Amino acid sequence: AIKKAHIEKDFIAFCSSTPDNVSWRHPTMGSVFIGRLIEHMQEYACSCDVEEIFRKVRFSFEQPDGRAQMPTTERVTLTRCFYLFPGH
Amino acid sequence: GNVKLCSLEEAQRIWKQKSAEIYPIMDKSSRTRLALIICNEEFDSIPRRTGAEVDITGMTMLLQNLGYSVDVKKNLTASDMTTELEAFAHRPEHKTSDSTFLVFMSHGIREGICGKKHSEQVPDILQLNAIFNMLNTKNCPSLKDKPKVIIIQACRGDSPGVVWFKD
Ligand SMILES: *C(=O)[C@H](CC(=O)NS(C)(=O)=O)NC(=O)[C@@H]1CCCN1C(=O)[C@@H](NC(=O)c1ccc2ccccc2c1)C(C)C
């Protein structure tokens, strides 16, 4: 039989900055948001769900310094933790 | 590779604690994970996003290291993107996948990502709400109940976002 399913669910957006604000990029090292997310992904992918890692990325932007920017996770609709279980 | 692996002990413990409140991942031998990376480096009007290549090389390699199949797309426009996104929600591999990673990298405005043909006179942006539309349980029932992580690297405006305050 037919069953109903939520139209929107299991989503999670992670923007490089907050509304109205810019994000920084280096012509030789590219964006900063991307490099930090990678740096963190490689390290915490094994023990933190993507939600905890995104927070950790944000916290890494907690102290402003000329090229300030605060990443934000939007439209989060994940119902459970999402572990990447690298190596598996 | 570079991604710190998860030992069986930890993999077991983590699942031992969160078991019911964690997304079930498909078998490493059967699942076919798909990831899409759309990044515009050159633009018809806006200054080229010099240094984008280093990000493409970064993500692709990382996602591929997380066990994903990365299909890189470049210099697209609002339409070209909204067409490339639909062909993705259609991919058959999702059916036999446990999740997906979307990745947008380009200039942007408060409204959304900027296609390669964007300009003040003639806009070419892709609202965020649209991206969520092309992959919902209605236009992509294959990803239903599966985590869909969306990453975006773009300016959300002009303001620096910093405010002065004395200590
Ligand atoms: C948002 O539109 C962009 C994101 C992007 O990569 N594309 S684009 C077409 O806009 O270039 N963000 C920006 O352009 C922001 C806002 C305006 C300038 N800008 C930059 O990122 C500049 N960045 C720097 O000058 C810079 C960033 C980091 C960094 C780290 C360490 C030493 C020096 C610098 C310098 C770029 C150069 C225009």
mmCIF file of C-alpha atoms and ligand atoms in Angstrom:
data_model
loop_
_atom_site.group_PDB
_atom_site.id
_atom_site.type_symbol
_atom_site.label_atom_id
_atom_site.label_comp_id
_atom_site.label_asym_id
_atom_site.label_seq_id
_atom_site.Cartn_x
_atom_site.Cartn_y
_atom_site.Cartn_z
ATOM 1 C CA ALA A 1 0.000 0.000 0.000
ATOM 2 C CA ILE A 2 0.982 3.652 -0.292
ATOM 3 C CA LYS A 3 2.433 5.370 2.763
ATOM 4 C CA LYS A 4 3.203 8.983 3.620
ATOM 5 C CA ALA A 5 6.784 10.207 3.980
ATOM 6 C CA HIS A 6 7.949 13.638 5.172
ATOM 7 C CA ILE A 7 8.628 15.747 2.091
ATOM 8 C CA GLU A 8 11.793 17.241 3.619
ATOM 9 C CA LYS A 9 14.054 15.333 6.012
ATOM 10 C CA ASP A 10 17.586 14.059 6.695
ATOM 11 C CA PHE A 11 19.075 17.328 5.389
ATOM 12 C CA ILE A 12 21.861 19.545 6.769
ATOM 13 C CA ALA A 13 23.390 22.627 5.147
ATOM 14 C CA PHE A 14 26.733 24.140 6.156
ATOM 15 C CA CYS A 15 27.362 27.648 4.817
ATOM 16 C CA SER A 16 30.753 29.364 4.675
ATOM 17 C CA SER A 17 29.426 32.418 6.506
ATOM 18 C CA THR A 18 26.339 34.148 7.875
ATOM 19 C CA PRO A 19 23.782 36.150 5.836
ATOM 20 C CA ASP A 20 24.827 39.519 4.379
ATOM 21 C CA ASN A 21 28.426 38.607 5.204
ATOM 22 C CA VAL A 22 31.391 37.612 3.065
ATOM 23 C CA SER A 23 33.560 34.516 3.208
ATOM 24 C CA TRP A 24 37.311 34.615 2.681
ATOM 25 C CA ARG A 25 39.481 32.993 0.035
ATOM 26 C CA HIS A 26 43.235 33.047 -0.596
ATOM 27 C CA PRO A 27 44.408 33.175 -4.257
ATOM 28 C CA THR A 28 47.066 30.607 -3.368
ATOM 29 C CA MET A 29 45.376 28.483 -0.710
ATOM 30 C CA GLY A 30 41.791 28.937 -1.836
ATOM 31 C CA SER A 31 38.861 29.389 0.539
ATOM 32 C CA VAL A 32 39.417 29.206 4.290
ATOM 33 C CA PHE A 33 36.121 27.569 5.188
ATOM 34 C CA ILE A 34 36.937 24.658 2.847
ATOM 35 C CA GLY A 35 40.441 24.151 4.228
ATOM 36 C CA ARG A 36 39.234 24.129 7.817
ATOM 37 C CA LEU A 37 36.381 21.702 7.139
ATOM 38 C CA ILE A 38 38.839 19.355 5.459
ATOM 39 C CA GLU A 39 41.374 19.724 8.276
ATOM 40 C CA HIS A 40 38.645 18.795 10.758
ATOM 41 C CA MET A 41 37.057 16.109 8.633
ATOM 42 C CA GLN A 42 40.365 14.257 8.369
ATOM 43 C CA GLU A 43 40.729 14.398 12.151
ATOM 44 C CA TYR A 44 37.276 13.934 13.702
ATOM 45 C CA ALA A 45 35.519 11.952 10.970
ATOM 46 C CA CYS A 46 36.173 8.851 13.080
ATOM 47 C CA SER A 47 34.567 9.875 16.401
ATOM 48 C CA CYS A 48 32.231 12.808 15.750
ATOM 49 C CA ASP A 49 28.999 12.883 13.756
ATOM 50 C CA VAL A 50 29.023 15.480 10.966
ATOM 51 C CA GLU A 51 27.016 17.781 13.261
ATOM 52 C CA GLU A 52 29.652 17.801 16.004
ATOM 53 C CA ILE A 53 32.403 18.385 13.445
ATOM 54 C CA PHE A 54 30.605 21.345 11.880
ATOM 55 C CA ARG A 55 30.310 22.898 15.336
ATOM 56 C CA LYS A 56 34.015 22.305 15.868
ATOM 57 C CA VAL A 57 34.623 24.112 12.576
ATOM 58 C CA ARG A 58 32.515 27.038 13.773
ATOM 59 C CA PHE A 59 34.320 27.185 17.113
ATOM 60 C CA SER A 60 37.516 27.430 15.047
ATOM 61 C CA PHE A 61 36.193 30.743 13.718
ATOM 62 C CA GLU A 62 35.264 32.015 17.177
ATOM 63 C CA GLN A 63 38.139 34.501 17.402
ATOM 64 C CA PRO A 64 37.940 37.285 14.760
ATOM 65 C CA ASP A 65 41.077 38.604 13.062
ATOM 66 C CA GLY A 66 40.743 40.886 10.041
ATOM 67 C CA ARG A 67 39.359 38.181 7.765
ATOM 68 C CA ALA A 68 36.556 37.178 10.130
ATOM 69 C CA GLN A 69 33.666 34.890 9.188
ATOM 70 C CA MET A 70 31.214 32.705 11.112
ATOM 71 C CA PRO A 71 29.983 29.559 9.299
ATOM 72 C CA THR A 72 26.396 28.493 9.968
ATOM 73 C CA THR A 73 24.533 25.225 9.627
ATOM 74 C CA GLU A 74 21.085 25.827 8.167
ATOM 75 C CA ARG A 75 17.910 23.849 7.538
ATOM 76 C CA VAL A 76 19.139 20.995 9.690
ATOM 77 C CA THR A 77 16.573 18.219 9.688
ATOM 78 C CA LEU A 78 18.747 15.238 10.589
ATOM 79 C CA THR A 79 16.851 12.968 12.984
ATOM 80 C CA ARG A 80 19.932 11.025 14.135
ATOM 81 C CA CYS A 81 23.716 11.295 14.418
ATOM 82 C CA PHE A 82 25.531 10.764 11.114
ATOM 83 C CA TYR A 83 28.828 8.987 11.672
ATOM 84 C CA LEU A 84 31.139 8.622 8.669
ATOM 85 C CA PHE A 85 32.897 5.595 10.179
ATOM 86 C CA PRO A 86 35.967 6.153 7.985
ATOM 87 C CA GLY A 87 37.661 2.885 7.082
ATOM 88 C CA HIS A 88 34.253 1.234 6.939
ATOM 89 C CA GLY B 1 43.793 7.644 3.474
ATOM 90 C CA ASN B 2 44.670 10.966 5.084
ATOM 91 C CA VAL B 3 41.344 10.587 6.874
ATOM 92 C CA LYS B 4 42.004 9.133 10.319
ATOM 93 C CA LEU B 5 40.410 5.687 10.194
ATOM 94 C CA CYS B 6 37.952 4.326 12.738
ATOM 95 C CA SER B 7 39.122 1.136 14.459
ATOM 96 C CA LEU B 8 36.690 -1.759 14.810
ATOM 97 C CA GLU B 9 36.776 -1.229 18.566
ATOM 98 C CA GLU B 10 35.592 2.377 18.229
ATOM 99 C CA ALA B 11 33.266 1.539 15.347
ATOM 100 C CA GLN B 12 31.729 -1.053 17.675
ATOM 101 C CA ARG B 13 31.584 1.140 20.786
ATOM 102 C CA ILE B 14 30.160 4.185 18.983
ATOM 103 C CA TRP B 15 27.471 1.963 17.486
ATOM 104 C CA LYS B 16 27.275 0.267 20.881
ATOM 105 C CA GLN B 17 26.164 3.495 22.533
ATOM 106 C CA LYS B 18 24.177 5.323 19.825
ATOM 107 C CA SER B 19 22.908 2.232 17.936
ATOM 108 C CA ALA B 20 19.243 3.364 17.593
ATOM 109 C CA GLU B 21 19.911 7.086 17.182
ATOM 110 C CA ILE B 22 22.467 6.715 14.394
ATOM 111 C CA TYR B 23 22.043 6.397 10.606
ATOM 112 C CA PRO B 24 22.712 2.854 9.341
ATOM 113 C CA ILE B 25 25.497 2.821 6.773
ATOM 114 C CA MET B 26 25.459 0.355 3.883
ATOM 115 C CA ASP B 27 28.008 -2.442 3.525
ATOM 116 C CA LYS B 28 31.461 -1.307 2.399
ATOM 117 C CA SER B 29 31.406 -3.931 -0.355
ATOM 118 C CA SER B 30 28.037 -3.182 -1.978
ATOM 119 C CA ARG B 31 27.179 0.496 -1.418
ATOM 120 C CA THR B 32 27.826 2.975 -4.241
ATOM 121 C CA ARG B 33 28.261 6.433 -2.721
ATOM 122 C CA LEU B 34 27.848 9.525 -4.878
ATOM 123 C CA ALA B 35 29.061 13.082 -4.305
ATOM 124 C CA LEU B 36 28.617 16.165 -6.495
ATOM 125 C CA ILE B 37 30.948 19.166 -6.577
ATOM 126 C CA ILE B 38 29.861 22.254 -8.520
ATOM 127 C CA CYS B 39 32.415 25.072 -8.395
ATOM 128 C CA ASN B 40 32.587 28.113 -10.669
ATOM 129 C CA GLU B 41 36.095 29.546 -11.114
ATOM 130 C CA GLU B 42 35.632 31.785 -14.150
ATOM 131 C CA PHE B 43 32.802 34.283 -14.595
ATOM 132 C CA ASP B 44 31.498 36.390 -17.468
ATOM 133 C CA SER B 45 31.432 39.494 -15.260
ATOM 134 C CA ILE B 46 32.544 38.909 -11.651
ATOM 135 C CA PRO B 47 36.296 38.524 -10.967
ATOM 136 C CA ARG B 48 37.572 34.952 -11.334
ATOM 137 C CA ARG B 49 37.693 32.954 -8.112
ATOM 138 C CA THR B 50 41.465 32.569 -8.306
ATOM 139 C CA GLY B 51 42.558 29.640 -6.156
ATOM 140 C CA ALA B 52 39.436 27.533 -6.613
ATOM 141 C CA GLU B 53 41.508 24.688 -8.063
ATOM 142 C CA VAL B 54 43.055 24.060 -4.656
ATOM 143 C CA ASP B 55 39.584 23.625 -3.159
ATOM 144 C CA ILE B 56 38.412 21.267 -5.904
ATOM 145 C CA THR B 57 41.518 19.158 -5.327
ATOM 146 C CA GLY B 58 40.857 19.326 -1.606
ATOM 147 C CA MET B 59 37.210 18.311 -1.408
ATOM 148 C CA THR B 60 37.251 15.739 -4.221
ATOM 149 C CA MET B 61 40.161 13.907 -2.614
ATOM 150 C CA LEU B 62 38.614 14.121 0.857
ATOM 151 C CA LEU B 63 35.139 12.965 -0.148
ATOM 152 C CA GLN B 64 36.698 10.223 -2.284
ATOM 153 C CA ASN B 65 38.632 9.247 0.831
ATOM 154 C CA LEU B 66 35.399 9.070 2.802
ATOM 155 C CA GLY B 67 34.337 6.438 0.280
ATOM 156 C CA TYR B 68 32.422 8.642 -2.137
ATOM 157 C CA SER B 69 32.328 8.937 -5.923
ATOM 158 C CA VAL B 70 33.086 12.535 -6.853
ATOM 159 C CA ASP B 71 31.717 13.980 -10.080
ATOM 160 C CA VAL B 72 33.223 17.459 -10.514
ATOM 161 C CA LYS B 73 31.359 20.131 -12.512
ATOM 162 C CA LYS B 74 32.645 23.626 -13.339
ATOM 163 C CA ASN B 75 31.613 27.124 -14.417
ATOM 164 C CA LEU B 76 27.868 26.516 -14.581
ATOM 165 C CA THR B 77 24.966 28.959 -14.570
ATOM 166 C CA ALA B 78 21.695 29.062 -12.621
ATOM 167 C CA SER B 79 20.005 26.899 -15.253
ATOM 168 C CA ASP B 80 22.947 24.631 -16.056
ATOM 169 C CA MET B 81 23.115 23.944 -12.314
ATOM 170 C CA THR B 82 19.411 23.385 -11.814
ATOM 171 C CA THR B 83 19.682 20.883 -14.682
ATOM 172 C CA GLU B 84 22.824 19.221 -13.337
ATOM 173 C CA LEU B 85 21.154 18.852 -9.945
ATOM 174 C CA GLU B 86 18.127 17.037 -11.366
ATOM 175 C CA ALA B 87 20.269 14.537 -13.263
ATOM 176 C CA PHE B 88 21.908 13.800 -9.908
ATOM 177 C CA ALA B 89 18.723 13.114 -7.958
ATOM 178 C CA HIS B 90 18.111 10.630 -10.745
ATOM 179 C CA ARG B 91 21.403 8.732 -10.524
ATOM 180 C CA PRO B 92 20.666 5.015 -9.960
ATOM 181 C CA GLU B 93 23.591 4.628 -7.566
ATOM 182 C CA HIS B 94 21.670 6.439 -4.812
ATOM 183 C CA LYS B 95 19.351 3.439 -4.482
ATOM 184 C CA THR B 96 22.346 1.414 -3.382
ATOM 185 C CA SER B 97 23.938 4.231 -1.363
ATOM 186 C CA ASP B 98 23.620 5.320 2.275
ATOM 187 C CA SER B 99 24.028 9.069 1.790
ATOM 188 C CA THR B 100 25.322 11.833 -0.471
ATOM 189 C CA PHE B 101 27.505 14.937 -0.341
ATOM 190 C CA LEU B 102 26.661 18.071 -2.300
ATOM 191 C CA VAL B 103 29.268 20.820 -2.606
ATOM 192 C CA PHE B 104 28.807 24.296 -4.066
ATOM 193 C CA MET B 105 31.740 26.688 -4.469
ATOM 194 C CA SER B 106 31.239 30.104 -6.062
ATOM 195 C CA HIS B 107 30.604 33.819 -5.607
ATOM 196 C CA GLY B 108 27.283 34.620 -3.972
ATOM 197 C CA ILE B 109 24.726 37.161 -2.807
ATOM 198 C CA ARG B 110 22.264 37.266 0.071
ATOM 199 C CA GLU B 111 19.846 35.433 -2.228
ATOM 200 C CA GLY B 112 22.118 32.567 -3.253
ATOM 201 C CA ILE B 113 24.962 31.004 -5.238
ATOM 202 C CA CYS B 114 26.071 32.857 -8.373
ATOM 203 C CA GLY B 115 26.169 31.151 -11.763
ATOM 204 C CA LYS B 116 29.059 31.984 -14.100
ATOM 205 C CA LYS B 117 26.875 34.419 -16.065
ATOM 206 C CA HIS B 118 25.650 36.458 -13.086
ATOM 207 C CA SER B 119 25.738 40.255 -13.241
ATOM 208 C CA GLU B 120 24.076 43.331 -11.730
ATOM 209 C CA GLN B 121 22.112 43.951 -14.915
ATOM 210 C CA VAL B 122 21.294 40.281 -15.442
ATOM 211 C CA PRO B 123 21.224 38.049 -12.319
ATOM 212 C CA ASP B 124 22.120 34.357 -12.402
ATOM 213 C CA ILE B 125 21.719 32.924 -8.903
ATOM 214 C CA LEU B 126 20.517 29.618 -7.433
ATOM 215 C CA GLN B 127 18.403 30.045 -4.298
ATOM 216 C CA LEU B 128 19.258 27.623 -1.511
ATOM 217 C CA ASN B 129 15.620 26.609 -1.161
ATOM 218 C CA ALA B 130 15.829 25.245 -4.714
ATOM 219 C CA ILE B 131 18.720 22.895 -3.959
ATOM 220 C CA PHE B 132 16.631 21.424 -1.137
ATOM 221 C CA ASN B 133 13.759 21.042 -3.597
ATOM 222 C CA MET B 134 15.644 19.048 -6.207
ATOM 223 C CA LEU B 135 16.676 16.429 -3.628
ATOM 224 C CA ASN B 136 13.653 16.031 -1.348
ATOM 225 C CA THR B 137 11.495 12.930 -0.891
ATOM 226 C CA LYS B 138 9.466 14.071 -3.898
ATOM 227 C CA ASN B 139 12.096 14.603 -6.607
ATOM 228 C CA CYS B 140 14.615 12.117 -5.257
ATOM 229 C CA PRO B 141 12.901 9.343 -3.239
ATOM 230 C CA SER B 142 16.101 7.312 -3.533
ATOM 231 C CA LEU B 143 17.839 9.421 -0.902
ATOM 232 C CA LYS B 144 14.848 9.306 1.437
ATOM 233 C CA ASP B 145 15.803 8.561 5.053
ATOM 234 C CA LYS B 146 19.469 9.059 4.133
ATOM 235 C CA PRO B 147 21.696 11.960 5.305
ATOM 236 C CA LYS B 148 22.239 14.614 2.642
ATOM 237 C CA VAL B 149 25.049 16.989 3.644
ATOM 238 C CA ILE B 150 25.168 20.289 1.702
ATOM 239 C CA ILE B 151 28.315 22.431 1.839
ATOM 240 C CA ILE B 152 28.479 25.917 0.333
ATOM 241 C CA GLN B 153 31.453 28.259 -0.033
ATOM 242 C CA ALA B 154 30.220 31.665 -1.161
ATOM 243 C CA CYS B 155 29.788 35.242 0.074
ATOM 244 C CA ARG B 156 26.377 35.832 1.600
ATOM 245 C CA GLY B 157 26.631 39.568 1.082
ATOM 246 C CA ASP B 158 29.035 42.507 1.210
ATOM 247 C CA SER B 159 29.299 43.429 4.895
ATOM 248 C CA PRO B 160 32.418 42.253 6.795
ATOM 249 C CA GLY B 161 30.175 40.869 9.527
ATOM 250 C CA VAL B 162 32.399 42.229 12.285
ATOM 251 C CA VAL B 163 31.300 44.807 14.829
ATOM 252 C CA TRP B 164 33.504 46.959 17.076
ATOM 253 C CA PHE B 165 33.415 46.650 20.850
ATOM 254 C CA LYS B 166 35.861 47.924 23.470
ATOM 255 C CA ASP B 167 37.316 45.850 26.302
HETATM 256 C C1 LIG C 1 32.338 35.510 -1.979
HETATM 257 O O1 LIG C 1 31.739 36.036 -3.159
HETATM 258 C C2 LIG C 1 33.835 35.281 -2.201
HETATM 259 C C3 LIG C 1 34.120 33.787 -2.309
HETATM 260 C C4 LIG C 1 35.006 33.450 -3.484
HETATM 261 O O2 LIG C 1 35.949 32.681 -3.327
HETATM 262 N N1 LIG C 1 34.704 34.018 -4.706
HETATM 263 S S1 LIG C 1 34.874 35.620 -5.251
HETATM 264 C C5 LIG C 1 34.397 35.743 -6.989
HETATM 265 O O3 LIG C 1 33.900 36.461 -4.609
HETATM 266 O O4 LIG C 1 36.260 36.001 -5.152
HETATM 267 N N2 LIG C 1 34.584 35.963 -1.152
HETATM 268 C C6 LIG C 1 35.300 37.048 -1.524
HETATM 269 O O5 LIG C 1 35.530 37.368 -2.692
HETATM 270 C C7 LIG C 1 35.838 37.890 -0.364
HETATM 271 C C8 LIG C 1 35.035 39.172 -0.162
HETATM 272 C C9 LIG C 1 35.763 40.195 -0.971
HETATM 273 C C10 LIG C 1 37.220 39.809 -0.964
HETATM 274 N N3 LIG C 1 37.195 38.371 -0.639
HETATM 275 C C11 LIG C 1 38.230 37.518 -0.561
HETATM 276 O O6 LIG C 1 38.080 36.338 -0.244
HETATM 277 C C12 LIG C 1 39.622 38.072 -0.862
HETATM 278 N N4 LIG C 1 40.484 37.403 0.088
HETATM 279 C C13 LIG C 1 41.623 37.937 0.548
HETATM 280 O O7 LIG C 1 42.001 39.043 0.167
HETATM 281 C C14 LIG C 1 42.332 37.088 1.502
HETATM 282 C C15 LIG C 1 41.618 36.007 2.122
HETATM 283 C C16 LIG C 1 42.291 35.135 3.025
HETATM 284 C C17 LIG C 1 43.668 35.368 3.302
HETATM 285 C C18 LIG C 1 44.352 34.513 4.235
HETATM 286 C C19 LIG C 1 45.731 34.746 4.573
HETATM 287 C C20 LIG C 1 46.442 35.851 3.974
HETATM 288 C C21 LIG C 1 45.792 36.727 3.028
HETATM 289 C C22 LIG C 1 44.420 36.510 2.674
HETATM 290 C C23 LIG C 1 43.715 37.354 1.765
HETATM 291 C C24 LIG C 1 40.020 37.703 -2.308
HETATM 292 C C25 LIG C 1 41.520 37.858 -2.493
HETATM 293 C C26 LIG C 1 39.269 38.581 -3.298
#
